[PDB]
């Protein structure tokens, strides 16, 4: 997916959520 919080992308949203919820990059 796509993440503006920090240059990050993944195979699917489920990972974006995890990436957003993991606190790796908060906005």
Which of 1, 2, 6, 12 binds Zn ion (CB under 5 A)? It is: 6
Asked whether position 8 contacts Zn ion by CB under 5 A, the answer is: yes
Nearest-5° angle of CA 4, CA 15, CA 12?
Answer: 90
Which of 1, 2, 5, 17 binds Zn ion (CB under 5 A)? It is: 5
Beta carbon of residue 26, minimum distance to Zn ion (angstroms, whole number): 8
Give residues with Cβ within 8 angstroms of 15, minimum separation 6: 1
C-beta atoms surrounding 20 within 10 Å = 18
Question: How many residues bind to Zn ion according to rule CB under 5 A?
Answer: 5
């Amino acid at each position: 997916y796509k993440c503006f919080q920090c240059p990050f992308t993944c195979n699917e949203k489920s990972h974006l959520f995890n990436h957003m919820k993991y606190g790796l990059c908060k906005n």
